[PDB]
Structure formats: C-alpha cells, structure tokens
Ligand binder design. Structure first.
Ligand SMILES: CCCCCCCCCCCCCCCC(=O)O
Ligand SMILES: [Cl-]
Ligand SMILES: [Cl-]
Length: 174
C-alpha cells in the first residue's frame, strides 16, 4: 500500500541550516551496503556567512579482519532547489578513509531535540531505493524523549525503513 518511491518522501519544510548547527549524537542507524560508521557516532554541523553548511563526524569504524579505528570525517553540503535536500561531499582527515558524495536529506527535525536524516545512494528501477542509509540524531546523548521518539518512529516508517535500524552505542570509545 504505502509509497516507498524515494520521489514521494517528504522532507523538512523550510529547513533552517543555522538552527541545525551544533552537536548531534547518532542514536540509531540504518546501514547501507558496505557500512562504514559503526558506533560512537557524533556529528558537528556548522554554517558559514555564505550560508554553506558543513559538518564533521567522529565514530568507530571497523576495517575488515576486525581492526577498530576512530574515524574523523569531514563533510560539505551543496544546496539544491529543495532547502532540505543536499549533496554531501565527504572524506576522512586520513587519506585512506572512505571518501565519496552522497545525497543528504533532512527528512525531519525540530532542531533542539531530534533529527532524521536519509540518503539514497542508488535507486531501484521502480523508484524505490536499492541502497540507502539513515541516521536518527539526538541533541542529548542519553536519547530522545518519548514524544520525539514517537515522531521519529513515524518518519522511519514513512521512509520504509522502520524495521531496519540498529541502536548506536556511546561508550567514550573515541
Ligand atoms: C551522515 C553523517 C552525518 C553528517 C556527518 C558528515 C561527516 C561525514 C559523514 C561520513 C558518513 C558517510 C558514511 C555514512 C554511511 C555509513 O556510515 O555507513
Ligand atoms: Cl512507541
Ligand atoms: Cl520494527
């Protein structure tokens, strides 16, 4: 019944980059293929006088054969016609860390409590996403209040991802 075409997904109306700046703690993640960020994921968003949004991120990533490593990542956001949809160029402060360019959608936020992010890296031929990821962010590292949690669950369902998240632990690894 529900529409899982990426083109149907609502995003944050009149998204305000300035209000979004600051520290966001990842509480949950839906992983893409070949997942990168594992846990202890903390993002820091900024916007400059030109209105350009950028971010940094720390988090544990586990390179294969079980090598752990606290990644330090950088992202810069190119605006689109939709104020809540961006193109995010990202790289690590170390050369060997994953780089690339992903869609970055702010699906919903209230700026001071929760945020829901979404990226479709590759569409299916029917307009659904073949390879997606999504972060749920909290301003408080101890988690969302119940009212925000319930709003987020609804947004998760609207993205057709509600069954596919895992919790992100924070234990001072970094
Ligand atoms: C989407 C991260 C929130 C914004 C922080 C941008 C800092 C660069 C982010 C690198 C994350 C790109 C990899 C996400 C997919 C994954 O972790 O498996
Ligand atoms: Cl609930
Ligand atoms: Cl579920």
């Amino acid at each position: 019944e529900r529409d899982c075409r990426v083109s149907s997904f609502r995003v944050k109306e009149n998204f305000d980059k300035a209000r979004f700046s600051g520290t966001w703690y990842a509480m949950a993640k839906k992983d893409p293929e070949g997942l990168f960020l594992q846990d202890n994921i903390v993002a820091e968003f900024s916007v400059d006088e030109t209105g350009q949004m950028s971010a940094t991120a720390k988090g544990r990533v586990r390179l294969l054969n079980n090598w752990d490593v606290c990644a330090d990542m950088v992202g810069t956001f190119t605006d689109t016609e939709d104020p809540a949809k961006f193109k995010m160029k990202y790289w690590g402060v170390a050369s060997f860390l994953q780089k690339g360019n992903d869609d970055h959608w702010i699906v919903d936020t209230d700026y001071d409590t929760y945020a829901v992010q979404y990226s479709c890296r590759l569409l299916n031929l029917d307009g659904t996403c073949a390879d997606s990821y999504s972060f749920v962010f909290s301003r408080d590292p101890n988690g969302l209040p119940p009212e925000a949690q319930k709003i987020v669950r609804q947004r998760q369902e609207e993205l057709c991802l509600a069954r596919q998240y895992r919790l992100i632990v924070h234990n001072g690894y970094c």
